[PDB]
Amino acid sequence: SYSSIKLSNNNNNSNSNNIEISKSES
Amino acid sequence: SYSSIKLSNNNNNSNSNNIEISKSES
Amino acid sequence: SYSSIKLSNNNNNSNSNNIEISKSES
Amino acid sequence: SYSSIKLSNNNNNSNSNNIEISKSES
Amino acid sequence: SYSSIKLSNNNNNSNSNNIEISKSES
Amino acid sequence: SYSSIKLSNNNNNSNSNNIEISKSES
Amino acid sequence: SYSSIKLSNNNNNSNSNNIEISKSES
Amino acid sequence: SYSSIKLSNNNNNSNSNNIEISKSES
Amino acid sequence: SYSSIKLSNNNNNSNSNNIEISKSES
Amino acid sequence: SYSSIKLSNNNNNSNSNNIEISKSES
Amino acid sequence: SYSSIKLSNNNNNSNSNNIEISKSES
Amino acid sequence: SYSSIKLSNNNNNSNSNNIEISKSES
């Protein structure tokens, strides 16, 4: 199970670049 | 199970680039 | 189960580039 | 499953490039 | 299941390039 | 199981770059 | 400037399901 | 400026399900 | 400025499910 | 600004599930 | 400024599940 | 500012599950 979150050089944003993930698997 | 999130050089955005994912699998 | 998200160099956007995904798979 | 999302070099957009996907599969 | 989304070099758009997909598959 | 969170050089952001992941696997 | 509305199969309602989205800017 | 509304199968409600979104900017 | 609303199968409610979102700025 | 609302299968409620969000700035 | 709301399968409640979020600045 | 709300499967409650968050800054 490989997970990688990398947020770089994100500036001056308003209400932006928000990530919401709801994943279900069987 | 590979997952990767990369946000780079996103600037001065308003109410933009928002990701909302709801995936269900069986 | 491969998943990837890459947001790069998206600037000065207003109410744009918003992704909303709701997938179901039986 | 394979899923890819890539947003690159989208600038100065108003109310544009929004994706809203609601898929079902039995 | 393969899904790909690629938004590149879309600039200065107003109320354009919006995608709204509601797909059902039994 | 590999996890990597890297937050770098994100400045002057308002209500932005937030990540919420609710992932379930079997 | 982008408005998508879908109302279907809402029956026998009383003072219900009223949506008001207002924005003022200056 | 981007508004997506989807009301379906809401029945026999009374003074319920009312949504108000207001934003004044200055 | 980005508003996504989805009401589905809400039935026989009384003074319920009422959402109000307000924001004033100066 | 960014507001995502999803109400699904809420039935027979009385004075319940009411959400208020208010923000005042100066 | 960023608000995400998801109410699903809340039934037969009385004066319950009421959420108030207030923020005053000066 | 940032508000995420997820209420699911809360049934037959009386005067319960009520959440208030208030902040006044001066």
Side-chain angles (χ1 to χ4, degrees), chain D residues 3-22:
Chain D
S3 179
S4 181
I5 295 180
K6 191 190 306 292
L7 276 62
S8 185
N9 302 86
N10 306 279
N11 310 287
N12 296 275
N13 297 281
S14 177
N15 297 116
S16 299
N17 309 298
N18 296 297
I19 311 303
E20 192 277 331
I21 300 181
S22 179

Side-chain angles (χ1 to χ4, degrees), chain E residues 5-21:
Chain E
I5 296 174
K6 191 191 302 298
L7 272 58
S8 180
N9 303 98
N10 303 111
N11 312 283
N12 296 279
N13 296 282
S14 179
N15 314 317
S16 306
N17 321 122
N18 294 297
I19 306 303
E20 188 255 332
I21 296 177

Side-chain angles (χ1 to χ4, degrees), chain F residues 11-25:
Chain F
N11 309 280
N12 294 276
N13 298 293
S14 296
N15 318 131
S16 299
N17 314 122
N18 297 275
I19 316 297
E20 182 192 8
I21 299 175
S22 178
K23 202 177 308 306
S24 182
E25 192 181 4

Side-chain angles (χ1 to χ4, degrees), chain B residues 5-24:
Chain B
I5 301 176
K6 291 174 71 175
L7 274 57
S8 308
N9 306 89
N10 304 287
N11 308 276
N12 300 280
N13 304 287
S14 178
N15 318 135
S16 301
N17 318 315
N18 295 284
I19 317 302
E20 191 276 331
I21 301 179
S22 178
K23 296 212 306 170
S24 180

Side-chain angles (χ1 to χ4, degrees), chain K residues 1-5 8-10 12-17 19-26:
Chain K
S1 310
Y2 181 101
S3 305
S4 188
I5 305 172
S8 56
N9 297 115
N10 304 271
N12 300 110
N13 298 285
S14 302
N15 306 90
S16 295
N17 317 326
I19 321 297
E20 282 155 67
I21 298 180
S22 303
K23 180 63 173 298
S24 301
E25 201 171 355
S26 166

